[model samples]
Target: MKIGANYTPSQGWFHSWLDLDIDATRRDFEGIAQLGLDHVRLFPLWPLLQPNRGLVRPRALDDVVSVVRAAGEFDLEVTVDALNGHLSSYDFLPPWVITWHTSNLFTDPLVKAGQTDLISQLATRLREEPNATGMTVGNEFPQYAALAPGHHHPTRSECTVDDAQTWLETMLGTMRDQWPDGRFWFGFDDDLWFVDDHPFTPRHAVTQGSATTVHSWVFAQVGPRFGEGHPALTWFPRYLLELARAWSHDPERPLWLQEVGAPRTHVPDSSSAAFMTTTMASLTSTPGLEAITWWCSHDVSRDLLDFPELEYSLGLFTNDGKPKPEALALSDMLPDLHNAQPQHQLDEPLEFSANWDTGAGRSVCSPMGDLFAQWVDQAEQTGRAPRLALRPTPG
Candidate 1:
């Protein structure tokens, strides 16, 4: 399986929008590439691309062209996420489009016509771009269902898996019709609904179509208290196992994990590293899995206030471009695991150590290593048996 990361250029932490420094962006791409990553999921703000919704902005187009060129220079594949989905709080839509939508300028017929025209224009413009491997139609639709007021819930109703499936099917069909040779992906958050025990199976349905693709995010599942009510990492392997079982039953389908990450505040560097190790192992163990893109590349600056906790430092590298301990651990592990056979069990319970020279900055080990050691040590000190047998071997 290949590894990649999300690359957002226009906006950084705190919803700050600025022209991305070409050199800085290039350096970020180079850092990820050096870590054995093959692709980078990139998003050029929709508003920037189409400043007036119907009018494509030359400046934004130039910025995108520069990004594509830089990716090629760094030998990275680019997957462009065309932001056609509902606007987020970050003000993703063009001002004119936002104004028109809010103004109720269209009757029912006109509304339909407007949406169709917008989609066509978007496809026509983007199809001409050579670097985009695929266009992501929507993002976190399920979560957005909760965010949107009653009028525009995509899921239709609670447990409306059919509705969700229909939306994706229609969007995919429309985009495919527009760009027959271009790829299309349905991107959503990883949730219980998408996994087993959910009524609707859009993934299964999508895979059935030869040209359809699916990807999900694990950001919601990476909290310290993650899966407390559900399956934790220990049970996570089974989730992938079952997914593979379902997909393998039909050989024509493909599965891709588009996003996955844990917050640095909640999951410490060691825990993050462990999660990466386990995630890689579990995914590779499953047959028919394709690509895995971690949610982000750099630690976002905690400049956003409204959702401060949500900004938990979650990146392989810090904002300043220094490698986190987990980043180094992943760098070491990725090359070995690429296309390698997966053992049913870990080769050995993983262990990590940190030896910091004072002048070198902070001493560190695997993010997972530190968290696991601390947990085990705490359990031992409290005369409680550890939950997992693996113990941290410190140097």
Candidate 2:
């Protein structure tokens, strides 16, 4: 029922590769804390820490510890991401790790052992922080395991739920053996084949994670009609509500909305703020879900034409450090949500049964489609209908 964000240094996801700015980090956490966030998810780039085999940079390790300590001063808890395998459009591999299998989760033994080694070293180092909760040793890695080396209309028949879950079990086992008492976890959703509907499947995110999470960007979920499907923002919260309910196998499982947002590069900032307000409305009202983490803490300028929609302007706070209306909306929403339990519900009978069998649960327009119809019915009757703005045609 609380809010947090997936944070990286403003320079981008590879903060550790730079000077590891302690002053900027302290100010970042202070801003996060002031925004009423419950915690912050951080990534420490893998290649930077393990540039050479049989060694990890002590200075880099010390820098991470320093940043974690700084968070405590601001009363913020940090979950260190052990492997940021790929970020934005860029993926990483240690320069020494050539001849390595691409996306090698279960198929590559040397790759697996080498990865476990890095995670083990970091777990021992990070366990020193009183607030270091867990480590996501892998990001959305397994998804790319067998993907052809390009962004073609490639099929995702590569990994299965059994294979993917098997990988998680083995890797987490090694991580636990290294730290024993430490918490270890992961969360991700590949853009393709993300709709697989089976327990412990990629569609459900890194299965049985310490805290389950799925990255949800409105533009990515629906394709062909992709960015054109922008009007779905009105029911975006309802769509997530359906997703959270479907993903939360039981109450013991806490779902972290690992990523959620619409870039201002595509939609105006006001539209983004409206989407966040409603998305949080659905997330905060749900009891079992653990956190709603905005995709990022800050924006960076990068020449990413492959991902044109994400080239720039996708932070809760603008580059100059002003909170967006979206950020302020959450600032208002979270404090009030902390006080208002059960403000919304998914338990009601559908006022329009034929509109959405939602029972298939494959597409957002499938299940969430009905949820929106039912919601609008109530809104029409109650005179509180939410607005639905069409995604303006890209120029």
Candidate 3:
């Protein structure tokens, strides 16, 4: 599998958008390429791109193009996320579209128009850059809906599964038309798989895009239930790859591990190197796996306020561009990752039903969570990757 990192600038932590600094970003990109990483994913804030419904800032679009250009100087590929809907623990929706103002981001006609315009504008600029290899329509955009945790819009009504499907169709369609040759996909948080009733379904996530994408963060629910040091915690990404593949229209569909990380909150600095070794060892052998992008490149500067404590230390490098233990370990593993071949076929499908409830909480009582726990146990015992075969739920 190709190895890289989600580019989180160590200096400003995305707040750098307020003042575009190519010199600082060039430094970070240079360090990322030097660490043996092949690519970096970039998130340009939605609010900064289109602060008002009628206006899409040209400067913001230019800033995105500028960063993608800088990445190319170091021979690093770029994946620019179209919308920065959610990052760390904060939501970055345009002021006019936030639900606090009684707007529905997915349903409102004007909001939809604005979203299409912004993405089309971004595609127009990025299509020219040879280094821009991929694009995700949004960053865990389902968080904007009431279905996700920490969704601060209390007055907005809950959205149905159809609403999300239509939203993806509109957004993904725009990119396919504008950047016809560029790889485009949508992403979701753990809620997409853990919550059966989550508006965003795995079928659409797998079928609608160029490839399936998954964001695997063990601390969200796994760490809390299995303890920080459990072997299952490190295997969560591999499980997600199988789960997503099992639900796909094509069994052999390629999967992008868009976000996976070992946070300092759960993994101590001393063990981070070992964690990287174990995680990549499992991921490289999994079938249908195309790439693995570490959650972030550099740690969030403590100067940034109100971010979840875990965000500060999830980076491969420190704020001032020093390689952490995991960075060194990953640098060493890059050669092996490129050479290791994936297992072609998974074991017989394990039957699973899409009837779990996120409201039940992420624990053994939660059916999907329970299934994951059992799957991990089985994989550990048999040294095989078990697949979850999920049939679509009837209306």
Candidate 4:
């Protein structure tokens, strides 16, 4: 899989979402390129760009166009992900968007009218940006459909895995034809469960996009919740195969792991490095996996001190630009990543990883605690054994 980081301006720069510091953006893009990164996933903070209707800010739009061109200069490809309002904490979606459509971005008719306009405005520039690849209409934005009810988004009119969603189609309608120069995707997350069922499931989004880009964290699991995702990481092989197979329903489609990382808050930095490396090794062997972009490029700025996970040291580089061991660990593979040339996967082991079986550990993963609880509950309802070591033989 091609490796890269999810780029967001550090600390204060990303505050208010779109109040970006152009100089910081230029330096960061260069920093990412120096890391031997093949690509960077950029977000056009919708709220900032289109904070007002028929009123698109010229400066921010200019910056996006400029930044992507900068990325190309350094040989880094760019993928413009749609702005997300609900994230590590909540409510990044513009107040105008919410009041106008009432947080029903995926289903409401009026929401489409307003959102499509903003999307078209972005495509106007992004399609022509240097090495500009594609636009993911919604950045796991569909997740609100399955998350805590009555929280930030509407939950009264819930959507099922099979629910016929017109919003993605609607979003795609404007993006695909308008941005023929680039591929279009709907990058969604929690594919293990949600892709099959639950909030913002992949079934609908994956079917719609030109290519499927899904996100996963090391802590999410299909096994016993030994500790927040600890078991899942140990049994990484099994969880990986399960996810790959589940997504296999569309084996012909390219699967890009758009967001990924095992935060130090959950696992110590060393172990965090190990999980990312080993897990990446596994995906390297998987045929259909196209890319794996780390959850982030750098630790977000301290502006989000309130949401600890959002600020966790999740990047291959420190918030200040120091390379973490994980970043170096990935170095040997970076060349092949940029080559578009296929490489051999690490030879497989006859036995599953040790942690994969004896995986449960002390479990307090504050950052993703909610997701942990949700997945555990789902496992109970499903009765699928989280234990892959217990299998008669490793597949």
Candidate 5:
């Protein structure tokens, strides 16, 4: 199993891109490699990359390649997200993509062209770099479709599941055209699988592009739905992996835990290391799960203001490039995990199909949610997860 982190630059949380400092970025990459991480996911903010519709800033594209090359010094593979639609609970879209503008992210022809061009430009630069792995179109774009509270624009109300699907295919096709053999894929938070009427359907999320990617955040529901200290909190990621596998077009499709993290509010300072161990163990035990990338590399600096409080402390390293307890714990466990084979195999996958809805009964609980809670309870008592299967919805 490959272990890595979502690279959050220690100096300025990606805002440092404006200044373009190689020394600072190199120091951050050194810390990530020392922690035994094999790769890092890089997010080049869309507004900075393409400040206007037809123009992709050459200096900005060069800055990203510079960062990718810096990671090559320590052999850290890079997965660049072409559009940073959302990050740390804030939307960072370009002005041309706002509600007041004529361009629509899903429907407008000009907007789609701009997105494709950006991916092509970036992929062209990284194509020859040995450590450049692939690109994910954007960061959790489903949230824009779901129209979650305080996370979207009124204009997004126009996008449908069909429109979003076309947009995804178009962007992914662009990557394939640029990097034929690259591990290109799309990313989504658990909302696509867990939320009812989410515009980005699970069918596209699992089947399209090179691999299926999931971002697991316990605070999404497990922490609030079932208290913070509950065992279900840790078990949630395993349940999501199973659910994604069950819904996949190919049961053997490669799975990427693109983002998983221990929020300070939920895991706490003293319990951070233990949380990392249990979560990592449960995820790696399942076969076909290729990689586990923790939420971030460095904690958000206190100097950066107005981010959600939990975001400040989720990193394996502090803002000043110092390794934390979680980093040490993860490094200590990698050797044993790399040597051990995956034991939890999906032997007989049963077939069933239904929307895993949480809209009914208290708005935060549902039959599927209850099923996961029970599965966690039983798996804790036994030594394995109960088997499940899902027939992928026909496209």
Candidate 6:
């Protein structure tokens, strides 16, 4: 189980600095490499790459080349996410493609043609990048489909798992047909309840021969509502079991945990540490699990200009190129596990950890709360304090 982390190029701070002064790329790469990670998943802004459906932007191509070269300099393997599904305020997809087609474009013939054209152009560009190892065809399409018109929740489109599967098959098939040599990866939000029925079932249907990549937003479950003893870990393990069962029937199949991370606000240090401990235990126990990439390399600020409301603090590092405790903890632990014996553990114990004052009244703070304090202290010391004025003025 090789551990990696997400190094998004679209990160607002990095993007802003890079745009103003191209030399910031080196600093970004250095910061990521310092984390002791071997691989970093880099996403090219689709809109920046292909502003128009058929036309490839020169600056975007230069940016891809620059990142690939930078990663190579740091001895990091780069996995490029060819984001195709949808466009948000973030650069997940090309603005022109989304604006022209919209949600209505998926089933439309002309829109399909336009999508194919855009994919072919993008794949060709990626194929030219020597450092590119794998490609995630789309980013979190399932979650989007779920919210579209009639999905499971009312006021949302009732697009079932099957509908999402069909889209995956179609998009992957098209990319495979165009770029036969490059590795193809299926990207999704890892919605346990919604995808329970279709676990690796799509693998049997899709003829593209690409590996499967599961993006697990498992950290979202670390809150009071869905904490340690909750069904979150079970959901992940079951999903892996089902995937393993399917892959067992097909020896050629490969599975990569494309993205996995706990939310900083939800579980920064010990909670995240526990989540990783449990994740490593579960996936190793499950058969045929290949690689796992943490959601982000650094904790990016959502308060940055033009930043989306969601996806604020998904990073492993803090905004100022410093390691968050979770990132630092993983950096220290993961390398040692490389040679350690595999422990097939599955019990989710209600473990508690705390920071306390023994001399005083013996008050204790939750592991997560302690982590938040650490971050707050770092923020204040650095003078890049978080926008929220609340600070732990520990007496």
Best by lDDT: 3
Ranking by lDDT: 3, 5, 2, 4, 6, 1
Q: How much does candidate 6 score in TM-score?
A: 0.69
Which prediction has more favorable TM-score, 2 or 4? 2
Query: In candidate 1, residue 247 scores what lDDT?
Result: 27
Shift of residue 24 alpha carbon in model 4, Å: 2.0
Model 2: lDDT equals: 0.60
Tens-digit per-residue lDDT, 265-330, candidate 2: 445766777777766665555555666778777766453234455635777776556787888888
lDDT per residue, candidate 3, 1-395, as tens digits? 78899999877888898888899999999999999899999999998999997889999899999999999999998989998887887777777865466567788887889889999999999999999986898888876664545333354446777787888889989998998998899988767666545666666777878888989887767777788778887888888887787667686688899999997767888989999998888787877778899988999888888887988999898999999989999999998888867675546777665532122222222323568778889878887777777644444
Q: Which candidate is the best by TM-score?
A: 3
Clashes of each: 6, 0, 0, 9, 0, 13
Residues 100-217 of candidate 1 have per-residue lDDT tens digits of 3543211233433444454455566567766657667545434433322222333222434455455556556767788787777755433322333232343433353333233332
| Model 4 lDDT per residue over 4-117, tens place | 888866645356244555567767777787777789888766677777656778887887787788778788888887656545545566666555445455556666687788
**Local accuracy of candidate 6 as per-residue lDDT tens digits, 1-395:** 57777775434644552373445566666777787777887666656666666676677766776777778887888776665343233435555545444543344455456656656666776676676676766565444444412223222223443454555567677777777877777566533322323222333322333655665554443244345544343244324333333323354566677777665445545566666665554454333456678777665666565554335566676666767666766777775545444443332211222111111111111112343344334433542322111122233
Stretches of candidate 2 off by over 4 Å are 12-16, 97-103, 146-160, 180-182, 190-193, 197-207, 223-231, 237-241, 247-249, 302-311, 343-395
Worst ten in a row by lDDT for model 1 = 354-363
**Order the candidates by TM-score, highest first — what do you get?**
3, 5, 2, 4, 6, 1
In TM-score terms, candidate 3 sits at 0.93
Candidates in order, TM-scores: namely 0.68, 0.78, 0.93, 0.77, 0.92, 0.69
Candidate 4 collision pairs = 11-301, 85-92, 85-93, 146-199, 195-202, 223-386, 234-355, 234-356, 235-356
lDDT of each: 0.51, 0.60, 0.81, 0.59, 0.79, 0.53
